[PDB]
Design a protein around this ligand. Sequence first.
Ligand code: 88K
Lengths: 243, 8
Amino acid sequence: ASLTEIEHLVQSVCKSYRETCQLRLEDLLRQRSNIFSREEVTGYQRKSMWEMWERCAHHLTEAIQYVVEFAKRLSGFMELCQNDQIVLLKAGAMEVVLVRMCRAYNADNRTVFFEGKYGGMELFRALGCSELISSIFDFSHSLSALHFSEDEIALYTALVLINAHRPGLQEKRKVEQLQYNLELAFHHHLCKTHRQSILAKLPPKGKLRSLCSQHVERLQIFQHLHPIVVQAAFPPLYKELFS
Amino acid sequence: KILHRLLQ
Ligand SMILES: CC1(C)CCC[C@](C)([C@H]2CC[C@]3(C)[C@@H]2[C@H](O)C[C@@H]2[C@@]4(C)CC[C@H](O)C(C)(C)[C@@H]4CC[C@]23C)O1
């Protein structure tokens, strides 16, 4: 890649991101006053743990579907062997969803858009993983403080996925090249827009991985205590990526 | 696999 070509990569990635979001950011912002009542929050909190897990896994699976669509749009992805496509998605799809979550998060009142209204972390109390949920909301709060542009969150999420260090890659040097192109595009864009200061403020590496690990650990406990629920009422895509 | 299917 040359200068015009680096800038074309920036543009391609941004368009891929915008085209594969669940909801438009303007529609999320316009709904910020629409907040779950105390009664509605209590309804969620009182739901059985298995049912709330099932419901949340359904929404998580839908979000993952959009991340797969995003991945399919990135240069080089569709040309990797299926092993490597799946390696990258297993290692990174949940990470991408956790980064995308900041679009739905309102830092002013620490709420997220879930099932048509905004609610706080206490909405999810029935899941029995409150430490994890708290850590996820704090991660969104950290990302909100960065005030990502569309370009910046598009490129940063591409880099979450296109990571040549993932164990199990059969074409590691190809993924290295893809990752480098993306890094150079990202850093070029930050240089041009006087936004290089965000690089020092991005979450440490390890942070996303730790949230993703916590999920898998919690899922292990759930699935052990409720194996028929998982078999019968969790989505196949979820089970393929996490169980 | 669902994931294989979604990939094409
Ligand atoms: C596996 C299960 C059940 C138990 C273990 C913990 C998680 C992974 C929680 C943690 C974060 C969690 C509450 C997630 C839900 O599944 C799905 C949502 C969700 C994707 C649901 C739809 C929303 O519109 C939005 C804002 C995009 C959130 C962000 C937060 C997220 C990821 O859940």
